[PDB]
Design a protein around this motif. Structure first.
Motif, PDB file in Angstrom:
ATOM      1  N   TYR A  48       4.156  -0.756   7.824  1.00 23.98           N
ATOM      2  CA  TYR A  48       3.667  -0.321   6.373  1.00 23.98           C
ATOM      3  C   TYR A  48       2.708   0.588   6.546  1.00 23.98           C
ATOM      4  CZ  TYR A  48       4.959  -5.636   6.651  1.00 23.98           C
ATOM      5  OH  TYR A  48       5.487  -6.295   6.464  1.00 23.98           O
ATOM      6  N   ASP A  49       2.622   1.190   5.191  1.00 23.58           N
ATOM      7  CA  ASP A  49       1.639   2.142   4.983  1.00 23.58           C
ATOM      8  C   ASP A  49       0.349   1.599   5.084  1.00 23.58           C
ATOM      9  OD1 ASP A  49       3.118   4.902   2.480  1.00 23.58           O
ATOM     10  OD2 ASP A  49       3.946   4.176   3.893  1.00 23.58           O
ATOM     11  N   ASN A  50      -0.789   1.903   4.595  1.00 14.96           N
ATOM     12  CA  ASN A  50      -1.785   1.078   4.942  1.00 14.96           C
ATOM     13  C   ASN A  50      -2.885   1.880   4.728  1.00 14.96           C
ATOM     14  OD1 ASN A  50      -3.491  -1.212   6.393  1.00 14.96           O
ATOM     15  ND2 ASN A  50      -4.868   0.100   7.838  1.00 14.96           N
ATOM     16  N   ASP A  60       0.931  -0.901   0.039  1.00 17.69           N
ATOM     17  CA  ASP A  60      -0.114   0.053   0.479  1.00 17.69           C
ATOM     18  C   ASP A  60       1.226   0.887  -0.124  1.00 17.69           C
ATOM     19  OD1 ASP A  60      -2.673  -1.073   2.628  1.00 17.69           O
ATOM     20  OD2 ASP A  60      -2.530  -1.818   0.657  1.00 17.69           O
ATOM     21  N   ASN A  61       0.070   2.641  -0.630  1.00 14.84           N
ATOM     22  CA  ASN A  61       1.268   3.695  -0.570  1.00 14.84           C
ATOM     23  C   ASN A  61      -0.200   5.126   0.558  1.00 14.84           C
ATOM     24  OD1 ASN A  61       3.015   4.793  -1.349  1.00 14.84           O
ATOM     25  ND2 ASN A  61       2.087   6.357  -2.384  1.00 14.84           N
ATOM     26  N   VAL A  62      -0.254   5.454   1.124  1.00 16.02           N
ATOM     27  CA  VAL A  62      -0.715   6.672   1.429  1.00 16.02           C
ATOM     28  C   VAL A  62      -0.304   7.766   0.963  1.00 16.02           C
ATOM     29  CG1 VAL A  62      -2.295   7.689   2.884  1.00 16.02           C
ATOM     30  CG2 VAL A  62      -1.763   5.240   2.643  1.00 16.02           C
ATOM     31  N   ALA A  63      -0.959   8.534  -0.422  1.00 17.25           N
ATOM     32  CA  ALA A  63      -0.027   9.577  -0.305  1.00 17.25           C
ATOM     33  C   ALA A  63       0.182  10.495   0.643  1.00 17.25           C
ATOM     34  CB  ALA A  63      -1.133  10.529  -1.407  1.00 17.25           C
ATOM     35  N   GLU A  64       1.329  11.189   1.013  1.00 15.00           N
ATOM     36  CA  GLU A  64       1.992  13.021   1.557  1.00 15.00           C
ATOM     37  C   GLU A  64       1.437  13.686   0.943  1.00 15.00           C
ATOM     38  OE1 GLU A  64       6.007  12.753   3.335  1.00 15.00           O
ATOM     39  OE2 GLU A  64       4.836  10.478   4.191  1.00 15.00           O
ATOM     40  N   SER A  65       1.212  13.760  -0.349  1.00 12.49           N
ATOM     41  CA  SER A  65       1.020  15.254  -1.231  1.00 12.49           C
ATOM     42  C   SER A  65       0.215  14.838  -1.864  1.00 12.49           C
ATOM     43  CB  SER A  65       2.395  15.842  -1.078  1.00 12.49           C
ATOM     44  OG  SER A  65       2.669  14.961  -2.580  1.00 12.49           O
TER      45      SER A  65
HETATM   46 MG   LIG Z   1       5.387   7.504   2.071  1.00 15.79          MG
END
Ligand SMILES: [Mg+2]
Lengths: 69, 68
Positions: free
Chosen positions: B9-11, A11-16
């Protein structure tokens, strides 16, 4: 002619707003590796959205390509 | 004291009960196996409570939350 396809390993949660969010297993088009002077950030397209992604969260889908259109 | 835990991890949350977070974020663990749910923890991150899979977190030894 052809762009690389890559699959998300994490997963990747956008920081911008310039960064894509995605889930493990998503398949995206790689438009440009190391875009705009960044080292390790790839410009990608996923379901019509575009943004940067950490390259090390992807694997190249070997043999599979998206037409540059 | 409440335990602190770091995200490994990202979630991406897909429902409002779940927290979204990024690798390296530190959150407060309010209750492990909350409501009897195996491997789901009630956590607070930046003042929002939700449930999180414990298997995405690492308990931080000796680090604890105490609300101001
Ligand atoms: Mg990141």
């Amino acid at each position: 002619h052809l762009n690389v396809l890559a699959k998300a390993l994490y997963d990747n949660v956008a920081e911008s707003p310039d960064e894509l969010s995605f889930r493990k297993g998503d398949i995206m088009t790689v438009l440009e590796q190391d875009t705009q002077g960044l080292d390790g950030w790839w410009l990608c397209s996923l379901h019509g959205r575009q943004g940067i992604v950490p390259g090390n969260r992807l694997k190249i889908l070997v043999g599979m390509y998206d037409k540059k259109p």
